Design a protein around this ligand. Structure first.
Ligand SMILES: *[C@@H]1O[C@H](CO)[C@@H](O)[C@H](O)[C@H]1NC(C)=O
Ligand SMILES: *[C@H]1O[C@H](CO)[C@@H](O)[C@H](O)[C@@H]1O
Ligand SMILES: *[C@H]1O[C@H](CO)[C@@H](O)[C@H](O)[C@@H]1O
Lengths: 92, 52
């Protein structure tokens, strides 16, 4: 049967049901990405798939976090400035 | 009189009732052209004392 939609909402966004309710896709606003999982598969146990990262860490609640550009962790034969732990949108 | 019981071979029970005919990830397949699968069960009953 279809999975239960309890405890699967995201902090600061909504969702839409695709594949006849067998998969939810998180809809964060413009400038955010859904923390780790973009979508969730409906496993046939009543509960959805766990919020597993790329490191397979169990996250309890989901939240729309801000979008960062990838930081330059390697650059040779010169100097780039400024160095930051992460880069927000519209940074130069 | 030998005080050891003899082996008895187990006999088959009757065939059970047919399971509901569904297909995985296909909602309800009733009154449609979607082929599914169904099952039926028996029970080996009566085998005691190292019988066949
Ligand atoms: C980017 O945005 C975060 C959000 O609070 C802020 O803390 C930070 O100072 C901003 N700038 C940089 C260079 O990370
Ligand atoms: C089940 O299959 C048939 C009846 O359909 C018989 O060979 C026997 O009753 C078995 O239990
Ligand atoms: C399953 O098959 C038929 C019903 O279609 C019957 O012979 C019996 O109910 C069996 O369990």
């Amino acid at each position: 049967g279809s999975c239960s939609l309890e405890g699967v909402e995201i902090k600061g966004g909504s969702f839409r049901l695709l594949q006849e309710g067998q998969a939810l896709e998180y809809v964060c606003p413009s400038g955010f990405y859904p923390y780790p999982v973009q979508t969730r598969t409906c496993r046939s146990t009543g509960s959805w798939s766990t919020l597993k990262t790329q490191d397979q860490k169990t996250v309890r609640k989901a939240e729309c976090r801000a979008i960062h550009c990838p930081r330059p962790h390697d650059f040779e034969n010169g100097e780039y400035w400024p160095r930051s732990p992460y880069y927000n949108v519209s940074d130069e | 009189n030998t005080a050891v019981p003899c082996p008895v071979d187990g006999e088959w029970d009757s065939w059970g009732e047919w399971s509901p005919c569904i297909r995985r990830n296909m909602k309800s397949i009733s009154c449609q052209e979607i082929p599914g699968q169904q099952s039926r069960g028996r029970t080996c009953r009566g085998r005691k004392f190292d019988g066949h």
